[PDB]
Amino acid sequence: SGFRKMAFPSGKVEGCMVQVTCGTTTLNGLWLDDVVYCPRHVICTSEDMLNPNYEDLLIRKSNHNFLVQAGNVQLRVIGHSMQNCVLKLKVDTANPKTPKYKFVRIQPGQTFSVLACYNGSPSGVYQCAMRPNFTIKGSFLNGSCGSVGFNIDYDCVSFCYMHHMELPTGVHAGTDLEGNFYGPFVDRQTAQAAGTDTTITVNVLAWLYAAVINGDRWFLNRFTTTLNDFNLVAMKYNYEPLTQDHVDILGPLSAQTGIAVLDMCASLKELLQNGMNGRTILGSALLEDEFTPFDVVRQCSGVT
């Protein structure tokens, strides 16, 4: 028992981190097989910041201008190409530490672990959610670009995020591993609107189930609700509308605890309307939405 915001073990990803330098800019790259992936903005200088012409900037670069160092050994770059907002540097040596991996585009509301890196060296790991507005609230400083987000399914690493930007609001934006941004963001030093965000309802309900499993039950009540009634409350409080697909994904937690999904919705409705009353749930004084129903099941069953 106990419930923590747990990240996946980062070892398989640590073995893929490299440093990429082009000109005076250094950031992180991900070395998988004989390719190093990194944000294309490694080719920018301070004057280019506002609206870089990446095609023209890249034309001024040759393979030998991309300095790739895997810890302390230098990689030989034999090709370079830009795919969306990422650069792919072909190297002459396959990473001996390449895990089984996939590139996936995650959905908003899904969670993943980030391995924060600086100069190709891992500094820490944390779990987070891709917000409904496609931003992430991470911990990134200058030099962290190229750090990646991922999930692990036993031996397979599914890479889902590569860090590119900090918006002027202090929230973060990045791409899938094909270089496509999540959200409306562009890799330019320009103020950019992140959409209206919402709280991930299905994750809050999953976390209320994790709370009941771990002994925090004070929020359970004598009520029930309907999806329609619950969605009026979700609307008022800027929560994602709950659908039958969400109720279906909560099936295992409802089956394990014996608390019907709509009865848990009535507990969530009461907490939204009345607050916590100075109490806590799993050590939090707010409704947590960074655990998916899969995360709760994995953590509550001991999956490795």
Residues that bind ligand LDX (CB under 6 A): 41, 44, 49, 52, 140-142, 144-145, 164-166, 187-189
Q: Identify whether the C-beta of residue 61 lies closer than 8 Å to the C-beta of residue 186.
A: no
Annotate each residue in 226-265 with x if it binds its own copies (CB under 8 A) or - if it does not, as one string. ----------------------------------------
Give the Cβ contact number of residue 227 at 10 Å.
16
Query: For its own copies, which stretch binds (CB under 8 A), given 44-52, 87-95, 141-149, 255-263?
Result: 141-149
Cα dist. 135→83, 84, 148, 234 in Å?
21, 18, 14, 21
Q: Residue 36's closest CA among 21, 51, 48?
A: 21
Smallest distance from ligand LDX to CB 11, Å: 23
The single residue of 38, 85, 117, 145 carrying the catalytic annotation is 145
Total of residues contacting its own copies (CB under 8 A): 54
41 is catalytic: yes
Evaluated on CA atoms 277, 281, 285, 287, the torsion sign reads negative
The single residue of 16, 22, 38, 41 carrying the catalytic annotation is 41
Evaluated on CA atoms 187, 189, 192, 198, the torsion sign reads positive
Helix (H/G/I), strand (E/B), else coil: 147:
coil
Q: Contacts with its own copies in 261-280 (CB under 8 A)?
A: 275-276, 278, 280
Residue 24 found at the interface with its own copies (CB under 8 A) = no
Q: Which is nearer to ligand LDX, 49 or 285 (CB)?
A: 49
Residue 14 found at the interface with its own copies (CB under 8 A) = yes
Q: Virtual CA dihedral for 245, 157, 91, 181, nearest 10 degrees? A: 30
Helix (H/G/I), strand (E/B), else coil: 126:
strand
Residue 281 found at the interface with its own copies (CB under 8 A) = no
145 is catalytic: yes
Which amino acid is it at 105?
A: R
Please state, in angstroms and rounded to a whole number, the distance separating the CA atoms of residues 212 and 221: 12
Smallest distance from ligand LDX to CB 95, Å: 25
Q: What angle do CA 76, 122, 128 make, to 5 degrees?
A: 125
Q: Which does 189 bind (CB under 5 to 8 A by kind): its own copies, ligand LDX, none?
A: ligand LDX
Among 115, 200, 262, 266, binds its own copies (CB under 8 A): 115
Annotate each residue in 190-229 with x if it binds its own copies (CB under 8 A) or - if it does not, as one string. ------------------------xx--------------
* Active site residues per annotation: 41, 145
